């Protein structure tokens, strides 16, 4: 079996980090359980690479994940304090709490899109076997 989930993620400056966790029985992997850190572009790279593969001409590659956008929430958070002085402590806390809820919503949607893409790949009997997909899953220089 090939089981992939995204346990955790980080949003920073303008960059988003996903943790891609793999559980597998397959002999082809060096280890049964491992985790790596990947960025949205890495997901895009995999999709494009699968598309390029001559052998997969007759298969439909799963659509790439949507690029994550945290711009509204990040922009608001910077502004929030920012004007910490202007407002009361309860006002500040409630606002910070609100903006956090927003981050979480964006997180839930983007995490799902990235995870679903990987899960579709593992579903495919041919695609799961792909060498590039494997490297994406467990290559860890650090």
């Amino acid at each position: 079996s090939l089981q992939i989930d995204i346990p955790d993620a980080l949003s920073e400056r303008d960059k988003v980090k996903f943790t891609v966790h793999t559980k597998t029985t397959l002999p082809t992997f060096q280890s049964p359980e491992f985790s790596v850190t990947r960025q949205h572009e890495d997901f895009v790279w995999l999709h494009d690479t699968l598309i390029e593969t001559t052998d997969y001409a007759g298969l439909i590659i799963p659509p790439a994940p949507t690029k994550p956008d945290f711009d509204g929430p990040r922009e608001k958070m910077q502004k929030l304090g920012e004007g910490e002085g202007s407002m009361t402590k309860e006002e500040f806390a409630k606002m910070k709490q609100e903006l956090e809820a927003e981050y979480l919503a964006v997180f839930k949607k983007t995490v799902s899109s990235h995870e679903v893409f990987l899960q579709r790949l593992s579903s495919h009997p041919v695609l799961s076997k792909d060498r590039n997909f494997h490297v994406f899953l467990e290559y860890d220089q650090p």
Binding site: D8, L10, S11, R13, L104
Partner: peptide
């Protein structure tokens, strides 16, 4: 502005977001 760290809930555990130094 701070980084935000997301933890997917260990179901049925709720998802969490935490403010990270940056």
């Amino acid at each position: 502005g701070p980084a935000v760290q997301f933890f997917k809930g260990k179901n049925g555990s709720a998802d969490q977001v935490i403010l990270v130094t940056q």
